[PDB]
Amino acid sequence: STRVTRLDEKQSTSRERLDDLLDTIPLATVALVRDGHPVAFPIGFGRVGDELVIHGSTGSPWLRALAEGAPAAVSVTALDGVVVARSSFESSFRYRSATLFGTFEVIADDAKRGYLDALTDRFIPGRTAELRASTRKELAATLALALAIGDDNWSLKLSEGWPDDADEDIAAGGWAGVVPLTTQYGAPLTAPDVAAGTPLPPSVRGMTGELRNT
Amino acid sequence: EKQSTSRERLDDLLDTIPLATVALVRDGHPVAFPIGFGRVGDELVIHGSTGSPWLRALAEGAPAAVSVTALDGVVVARSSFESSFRYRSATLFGTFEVIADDAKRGYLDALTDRFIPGRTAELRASTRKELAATLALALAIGDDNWSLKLSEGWPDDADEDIAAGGWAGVVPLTTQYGAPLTAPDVAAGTPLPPSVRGMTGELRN
Ligand SMILES: Cc1cc2nc3c(=O)[nH]c(=O)nc-3n(C[C@H](O)[C@H](O)[C@H](O)COP(=O)(O)OP(=O)(O)OC[C@H]3O[C@@H](n4cnc5c(N)ncnc54)[C@H](O)[C@@H]3O)c2cc1C
Ligand SMILES: Cc1cc2nc3c(=O)[nH]c(=O)nc-3n(C[C@H](O)[C@H](O)[C@H](O)COP(=O)(O)OP(=O)(O)OC[C@H]3O[C@@H](n4cnc5c(N)ncnc54)[C@H](O)[C@@H]3O)c2cc1C
Ligand code: HEM
Ligand code: HEM
Ligand code: NI
Ligand code: NI
């Protein structure tokens, strides 16, 4: 269920490392079953304490399926680089990946406002304090859902090593190494309907460097 | 509509992003794994250990859903309701076919050349033992069995919010190769190979 089979010295049980990954990557891929068939869809998520939270239209069939109790598996992955070995067999990727399992719970109408504010502040930190409150109609058009991050329902796999070359290939010489991969925020692009010379909000001024989820 | 039907655009995404997430069903319940993939013409190809339980399930006929996503930006609107991510995502459905022993060498070389272009012509051939330890699987990309969602919009704010002012826009995200890191057991002054020197700028088509 939660135990890695292959290269299981890459499995980590640190919850702290888990949070670090979940607070870095804003995209999750969610898998569920419909009529015996698998389905998978990407979606933004934020970790709000010990819950993974998503949201979307109350009219999405996918989100409705989860709201109705479809058991789910949630995958979150950071691709950190390419492992260039002296053979193709030992070539690889550096990455960090988490997989979480359970049933999403529907956030109650009374709680949606608070979870959505916290979700927004994952995606664009400090943004909630800059915006107007959501309207009752906006909230009624939104389904928010939360999956519990417990002790037993998650697995973390970490690969950040170097090529592991056969001694034969070493002897032959040749270059080996890692080409890193990073995901970075670009300079912001102002929308055409924004008044000329309007400043960047502080929250957006923060969206610089390598992509994070807090 | 944000659903695209262009096979050319699908290929463009599959030739950009090397990570897939594969969903399948074990015991009426869902499982999801990340894996590297390459597009080899009209097949999406993955590989790993003959001893991996989940690759074995695929090999055994388990129907799959394969998701490939590129995150392109943060859509920052005047309201949190209208804020979102710019992204491209494909989902492909079907059953992976096991690649035959006689065919694996060719497919794995093609796969290598997706992940590190030009690299196979630089390396020695894989050994029989290496091949034998490897399971390679291919999912057909047909006319029917996929969908492509492309959201590359600007924020669409209500009139009342535009009139109230405030900034809005898009903060792009890009994924870039960094400077190579030479492994500890390589001699100082061994030059970078041509394949590696070609790996600069964006994770790119
Ligand atoms: C960016 C990236 C690229 C990858 N490319 C490849 C590839 O090209 N070939 C390949 O074989 N593998 C690749 N993997 C790893 C792949 O996800 C599996 O770890 C691998 O196939 C071995 O799985 P298994 O047989 O051990 O899992 P199984 O024994 O079938 O699964 C048992 C349990 O292990 C845990 N687990 C397994 N893998 C992961 C994971 N990756 N993250 C979190 N939890 C996990 C889960 O809880 C799971 O239910 C890649 C991973 C990442 C992040
Ligand atoms: C980076 C990223 C972040 C996202 N964040 C959010 C979010 O925060 N909230 C939210 O509601 N949605 C988000 N989405 C979109 C999500 O994938 C769905 O499009 C959305 O939940 C509505 O799905 P649906 O119920 O209309 O599709 P359904 O009607 O349930 O599915 C029908 C079929 O349409 C096709 N399809 C649907 N979506 C996609 C896709 N994305 N890629 C390829 N094929 C597809 C599939 O074949 C699917 O089986 C995000 C997508 C990306 C890539
Ligand atoms: C050239 C680029 C290649 C890349 C980027 C690549 C990447 C990977 C990755 C990411 C893994 C998963 C390791 C893990 O679980 O953490 C893996 C496993 C594996 N790859 Fe590759 N690979 C490549 C080429 C090859 C080739 C050519 C073969 C065979 C000839 C091969 C055989 C295997 C095998 C057998 C495993 C299973 C590892 C194990 O569980 O012991 N790979 N590969
Ligand atoms: C603040 C950061 C937020 C981000 C990054 C975000 C992101 C997204 C994304 C990516 C989508 C998918 C659009 C698509 O289908 O292509 C979406 C849909 C949606 N979001 Fe958000 N969102 C945010 C805040 C909010 C809030 C606070 C609400 C409600 C109060 C809201 C309500 C919705 C609704 C209803 C949809 C479905 C749109 C539709 O299909 O009609 N969002 N969001
Ligand atoms: Ni609030
Ligand atoms: Ni060949």
Given resolution (angstroms): 1.9
What's the CA gap between A59 and B104, in Å, rounded? 45
- Residue labelled with tokens 């097949």: B43
Q: What is the 3-state secondary structure (H, E, C) of chain B?
A: CCEECCHHHHHHHHCCCCEEEEEEEECCEEEEEEEECEEECCEEEEEEECCCHHHHHHHCCCEEEEEEEEEEEEEECCCCCCCEEEEEEEEEEEECEECCHHHHHHHHHHHHHHHCCCCHHHCCCCCHHHHHCEEEEEEECCCCCEEEEEECCCCCCCHHHHHHCCCCEEEEEEEEECCCEECCCCCCCCCCCHHHHCCCCECCC
> Closest chain B residue to A135 measured between Cα atoms?
B81
Residue type, B201: G
- Residue A191 three-state SS: coil
- If you count residue pairs, one on A and one on B, with CB atoms under 8 Å apart, how many are there? 265
Instruction: Report how far apart, in Å, the C-alpha atoms of A211 and of each of A21, A105, A157, A168 are.
Output: 11, 28, 20, 40
Residue of B27, B37, B81, B204 to mutate, testing the A interface (most A Cβ within 10 Å of its Cβ) = B81
Whether B168 and A175 lie within 8 Å, measured CB to CB: no
Whether B179 and A178 lie within 8 Å, measured CB to CB: no
Write out chain B residues lying below 8 Å of A161, CB-based. Answer: none
| Residue A16 parent element (H or E) | helix A15-22
Distance of CA A80 to the CA centre of its chain: 14
Residue type, A193: D
Pairing of strands B181-182, B134-140: unpaired
What's the CA gap between B16 and B11, in Å, rounded? 9
Nearest to A73 by CA among A152, A10, A154: A154
What's the CA gap between A90 and A81, in Å, rounded? 14
- The CATH number that applies at residue A153 is 2.30.110.10
Q: Are A73 and B30 in contact (CB under 8 A)?
A: yes
Residues of each annotated binding site of A for heme b: 6, 10, 55, 95, 157
What's the CA gap between B203 and B205, in Å, rounded? 7
Backbone angles phi, psi at B107, to 5 degrees: -70, -40
- b/e map of B173-183 (b: 16 or more CB within 10 Å)? bbbebeebebb
Residue A192, class by beta-carbon neighbours within 10 Å (0-12 exposed, 13-18 middle, 19+ buried)?
A: exposed
What's the CA gap between A132 and A44, in Å, rounded? 22
Q: Which residues, 6+ apart, have CB-to-CB distance to A94 below 8 Å?
A: A79, A80, A81, A82, A83, A159, A160, A161, A178, A180, A181
Whether B81 and A142 lie within 8 Å, measured CB to CB: yes
B48 lines ligand 3 (CB under 6 A): yes
List the Cα angle B23/B25/B28 in 5-degree steps: 145
Nearest to B137 by CA among B70, B198, B204, B49: B49
Residue A40, class by beta-carbon neighbours within 10 Å (0-12 exposed, 13-18 middle, 19+ buried)?
A: buried
Find the farthest-apart pair of alpha carbons in chain A and give their distance in angstroms, rounded: 69
Instruction: Report how far apart, in Å, the C-alpha atoms of A12 and of each of A8, A21, A162, A178 are.
Output: 9, 12, 18, 22
| Residue A161 parent element (H or E) | none
For chain B, the domain total comes to 1
Nearest to B81 by CA among A209, A57, A95: A57
What's the CA gap between A149 and A135, in Å, rounded? 30
- Residue labelled with tokens 């270059």: A175
User: DSSP secondary structure string, A32-92?
Assistant: EEETTEEEEEEEE-EEETTEEEEEEETT-HHHHHHHTT-EEEEEEEEEEEEEE-SSSTT-E
Backbone angles phi, psi at B70, to 5 degrees: -120, 120
Residue type, B151: S
Residue type, B162: I
What's the CA gap between A23 and A43, in Å, rounded? 15
Instruction: Report how far apart, in Å, the C-alpha atoms of A62 and of each of A41, A69, A81, A158 are.
Output: 8, 11, 32, 30
Q: Which residues, 6+ apart, have CB-to-CB distance to B187 below 8 Å?
A: A173
What's the CA gap between B200 and B105, in Å, rounded? 28
Instruction: Report how far apart, in Å, the C-alpha atoms of A65 and of each of A54, A62, B133 are.
Output: 13, 5, 39
| Residue A129 parent element (H or E) | helix A127-130
| Residue A95 parent element (H or E) | strand A92-103
Domain that holds residue B136: 1-205
What's the CA gap between A161 and A82, in Å, rounded? 10
Residue B167, both tokens: 């900034």
Residue type, A175: W
Write out chain B residues lying below 8 Å of A103, CB-based. Answer: none
Q: Which residues pair with B40 in a beta bridge?
A: B43
Q: Are B66 and B44 in contact (CB under 8 A)?
A: yes
Residue A58, both tokens: 């109350």
- Residue A116 three-state SS: helix
What's the CA gap between A175 and A5, in Å, rounded? 30
Whether residue B153 lies within 8 A of chain A, CB to CB, comes out as no
Pairing of strands A142-148, B146-151: unpaired
Nearest to A66 by CA among A76, A55, A77: A55
Structure solved via: X-ray
Instruction: Report how far apart, in Å, the C-alpha atoms of B79 and of each of A131, A174, B156, B167 are.
Output: 6, 54, 10, 10
